[PDB]
Design a protein around this ligand. Sequence first.
Ligand SMILES: CCCCCCCCCCCCCC(=O)SCCNC(=O)CCNC(=O)[C@H](O)C(C)(C)COP(=O)(O)OP(=O)(O)OC[C@H]1O[C@@H](n2cnc3c(N)ncnc32)[C@H](O)[C@@H]1OP(=O)(O)O
Ligand SMILES: Cc1c(NS(=O)(=O)c2c(Cl)cc(-c3ccnc(N4CCNCC4)c3)cc2Cl)c(CC(C)C)nn1C
Length: 390
Amino acid sequence: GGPIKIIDPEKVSKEPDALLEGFEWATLDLTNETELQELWDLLTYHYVEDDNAMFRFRYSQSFLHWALMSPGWKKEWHVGVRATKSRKLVASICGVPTEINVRNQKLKVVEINFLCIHKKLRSKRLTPVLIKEITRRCYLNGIYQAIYTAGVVLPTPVSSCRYYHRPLDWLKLYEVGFSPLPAGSTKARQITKNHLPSTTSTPGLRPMEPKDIDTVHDLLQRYLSRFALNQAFTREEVDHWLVHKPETVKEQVVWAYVVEDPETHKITDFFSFYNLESTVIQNPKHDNVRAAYLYYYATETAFTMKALKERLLMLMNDALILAKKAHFDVFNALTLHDNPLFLEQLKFGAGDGQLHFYLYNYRTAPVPGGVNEKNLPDEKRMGGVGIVML
Ligand SMILES: CCCCCCCCCCCCCC(=O)SCCNC(=O)CCNC(=O)[C@H](O)C(C)(C)COP(=O)(O)OP(=O)(O)OC[C@H]1O[C@@H](n2cnc3c(N)ncnc32)[C@H](O)[C@@H]1OP(=O)(O)O
Ligand SMILES: Cc1c(NS(=O)(=O)c2c(Cl)cc(-c3ccnc(N4CCNCC4)c3)cc2Cl)c(CC(C)C)nn1C
């Protein structure tokens, strides 16, 4: 496929459209602590909830810094709406630039994320106005395509992936209302079921060091080449998205571990996961759930069997152990990548959550999301989604 429409830079308006009475546009400068705080204060209380919520995403200020100021970031693409009188931030839509591969065609796109409207300004119909504005600010910088992720079904989706959840602290998930008691079982037997070993198994497993950047960049891109829709990682993107800088970063957000074969001594494997907290609304016992999310990963055994199934089962179980020691409660993953190989065997529970992938101004054939028609993981429905959006 290809682009749907060609944009004339000559017809892109210098000024933005009109907003609701009493509200004005604002470019967020996330280099300043006050403005980063303002966005955090908005999202913590007004961002993605579940239906019964219960739960709401608590993206940390260290996460927001990490997700919105990646290589090539422009402040223009951190769009906010302020109340004219009070100066309070009441809405947001954000974007960062990246390259994605859509069926071998390379594309300049913006990753659209953190769409948020204050609860008091709900519909209203403010979303299309927020979409049009960040679209205009992209059009002025020479970006006419977008990739975005949404848990709601919208016009013409590219793919659909189901959420999966591995309990590291089952009692915690049970007490907050996330994990049920199925069916004629006790609490203790569910905890005994989710018991993990204390030590990692994979030979030569260690945290990723900045020396591993070039080698991880090559391995990851060769692995992502196996997917129809994937992120064309640059060296700086590998550095930013995959190596934690504790200098610098006081509240760790990303985790990366590598192997590091005892004989090569070239690296043959790597996996990663990030820190995204969720607030429990009706507190009682707990008020916070710490969740780890499977990020990017690769392995040399893929380029062959199915020994890839065997290898990922060892690596991802190791990732669960390392997540537990890092005090995470649940390990989240989607049916994207080669995940339908290890998910069910490693005691990941089928989730109610569904994540849909979309493209703006780019027509392409439907891409498999790792699930069959029953929404169950399928080995034959992989090789599609190779991009993880935060
Ligand atoms: C080249 C540059 C292009 C870049 C742009 C690419 C496009 C990217 C688009 C942005 C992708 C962002 C990716 C993420 O960040 S996904 C996360 C979205 N955020 C949340 O879920 C946070 C909690 N929710 C809210 O704050 C609000 O409920 C939101 C803001 C979602 C809607 O506020 P409200 O409830 O007050 O609704 P409205 O009256 O203003 O407007 C109603 C319209 O909004 C459309 N809607 C609903 N949900 C979503 C959604 N998740 N993605 C896109 N659109 C959505 C819907 O079709 C409806 O249109 P229509 O069916 O009536 O016709
Ligand atoms: C709804 C929710 C859950 N449950 S869940 O099944 O894992 C889940 C569910 Cl139901 C829905 C989403 C969800 C919904 C809508 N959009 C998104 N995306 C928005 C764009 N960025 C990626 C996430 C995710 C994400 C998750 Cl992680 C959780 C994890 C619990 C273990 C606390 N937190 N929250 C706020």
